[PDB]
């Protein structure tokens, strides 16, 4: 039979519905949450753009095949261990954001197992100070 398009449909569906969940989640935010989320997009894009080269050199150390999943996290979380400043959080988030952008053929889960749990907890710690740093 004609099967040579089966994997294309699989890939596009997973992308499609994932984008639809995201839209469903954004829709259930109030305007304040939307304005904060908008600020996070723009902040990280600024940092990713102005530190394009710096991130590429950091991305190469993390990209090689040797690292375990915890080893990536422990490298990223090291900055947050001693330095809990909100800007350090924002840079960390922007770097995580850049890694996600380059892993568009890897599994989404592979990216989420870097961010979620420990790392996002440490960013959310004193979230009020983080939000205030971002919203001005």
């Amino acid at each position: 039979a004609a099967i040579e398009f089966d994997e294309i449909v699989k890939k596009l569906l997973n992308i499609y519905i994932n984008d639809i969940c995201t839209t469903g989640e954004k829709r259930l935010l109030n305007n304040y949450e939307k304005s904060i989320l908008d600020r996070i997009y723009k902040s990280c894009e600024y940092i990713k753009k102005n530190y394009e080269l710096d991130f590429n050199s950091m991305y190469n150390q993390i990209n090689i095949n040797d690292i375990t999943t915890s080893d990536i996290k422990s490298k990223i979380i090291e900055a947050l261990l001693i330095d809990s400043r909100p800007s350090v959080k924002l840079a960390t988030l922007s770097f995580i954001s850049l890694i996600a952008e380059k892993w568009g053929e890897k599994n989404r889960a592979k990216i989420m197992e870097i961010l979620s749990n420990e790392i996002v907890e440490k960013i959310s710690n004193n979230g009020k100070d983080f939000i205030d740093f971002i919203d001005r």
């Binding site: 990223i76 090291e78 900055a79 800007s87 840079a91």
Partner: peptide
């Protein structure tokens, strides 16, 4: 702590900016 050493560096430089 090489990646960490740069995240703070970017953090400092952006801290001054905003």
């Amino acid at each position: 702590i090489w990646i960490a050493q740069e995240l703070r560096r970017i953090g400092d430089e952006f801290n001054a900016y905003y």
